[PDB]
């Protein structure tokens, strides 16, 4: 049992990636696993004494590195969608709109290093291969933007909290300023690079399913063509204010 | 506001008008019901004094904007309902291009469980062979916007709009409206930001009615105010998504 084989069994029960199975599904999960698994028996006993989280069962079957790969951000999530795109941009080094195995391997190498974990180059390729098996949904040999979001346990769309009422001039301004401060991580007065990316992603996702990395590139240029008044490729506060109908231009 | 609560289901309506246009006297009654939750109005009007000396379309606006549908994000701008139940006074001058003008005063309020609109209308300076006294307007009606602004001094609103009445030779008769609405009570009311009511009307007949009459159905919605910022975000997203 490698992590990929385990994941594949688990995904037959956790079909909606809830990250748990039901307790009823537990016995039949063990049956799939038993097709030395004798640790299985030990395992049942372990917490047989309403759901069953993946970390619980996985703690008992996968290696310590494999548990790290599967849960290293369910513990410590991202800052926000800007940090997410920063990672995406860094590792899609050819800007393909897709993360390849050679690219994913670099992500894992850097991740292990910075977590202060030593692993051999042969380990790194097994992990690369294992991670690809788990997260490459359409089995096309590449990871899409949402796949990396799932590896990173990307949290909820920040923009969903804002409400249709709250139309007051004061409310719109409070909400503009909160939105702008969120994406302007570097505090420059403008959205640049992944700050743009993160805002595009969150905005587009208000009205359509999770977008691909190729489409993020397309929507990013469409947004710039819409509101980039001085055409410098960054979105100054005043440009976004005007395009969101803010009454007094900052 | 507490007025909103009074418009939650179907509400009966009565209308009474007494008029005099260039000396011709008439009286009109109407009854029906309003359904603000769906912006809908259903009414039937009758001339109780015989033949209507003007065309029915010239009276539509005079013959209850409290039955407009204000979307949830615009409830703070609905003056009409906020003045209920005590009601409001509605005053207008209506100028028909190249012809006469009407001047009206009405009181709109709850009388028991019924919303009642009582009106007095006076028209002067009409040409006898014009489009109005000559009955040359078509029995139909166009869609318009009604622009509403607060009038903070009088603790009401001032309203302006233009209606277009099709004439039988294919041209158009304009009617220019100036409108003031003032609360009857001294309780406080909602003074809105600038906006409009988008209005659509359809005129028809009651198949069993022998008297001179008009059946009117109306659908009205408030609009034109800015929503929460999430609204501009969603709207921009949809637009960016096109063609791509
Ligand atoms: Ca790539
Ligand atoms: Ca794929
Ligand atoms: Ca910035
Ligand atoms: Ca710019």
Numbering used by the authors:
A (entry chain D): 12 to 46, 56 to 69, 76 to 276
B (entry chain A): 2 to 64, 68 to 248
Give verbatim excerpts from the published study on this entry.
Since GFP carrying the SNAP-derived peptide (155-GIIGNLRHMALDMGNEIDTQNRQ ID-179) at its C-terminus allowed for the formation of a stable complex with secretagogin, this ensemble was used in X-ray crystallography studies. We determined the X-ray structure of both mouse and human secretagogin bound to the SNAP-25-derived peptide ligand at 2.35 Å and 2.30 Å resolution, respectively. In contrast, the N-terminal A domain lacks Ca2+ ions consistent with the sequence alterations in both EF-hand motifs. The SNAP-25-derived peptide was bound at the groove formed between the two EF-hand modules of the C domain of secretagogin. The electron density map allowed us to model a 17 AA-residue (155-GIIGNLRHMALDMGNEI-171) and a 16 AA-residue (155-GIIGNLRHMALDMGNE-170) section of the SNAP-25 peptide for the mouse and human secretagogin complexes, respectively. Hydrophobic interactions extended on the buried interface of SNAP-25c (155-GIIGNLRHMALDM-167), particularly at residues I156, I157, L160, M163, A164, M167 in the groove formed by the Ca2+-loaded C domain of secretagogin, presenting Van der Waals distances between 3.5 and 3.9 Å to the surrounding residues. The buried surface area of the peptide ligand in the mouse secretagogin was measured as 914 Å2, corresponding to 51.7% of the total surface area (1,765 Å2) of the 16 AA-long SNAP-25c segment within the complex. The R198A mutation impaired secretagogin binding to SNAP-25c. Hence, the C-terminal helix of SNAP25 is expected to be bent or partly unfolded upon binding to secretagogin, which likely prevents its involvement in the SNARE complex.
Secretagogin is one such EF-hand Ca2+-sensor expressed exclusively by endocrine cells of the pancreas, adrenal medulla, pituitary, gut, stomach, and subsets of neurons in the nervous system. In mammalian secretagogin, domains B and C undergo conformation changes upon Ca2+ binding, and form a surface groove in domain C for the docking of both SNAP-25 and syntaxin-4-derived peptide ligands. Here, we identify secretagogin as a molecular switch between syntaxin-4, a protein facilitating the movement of reserve vesicles toward the active zone, and SNAP-25, a core member of the vesicle fusion complex.
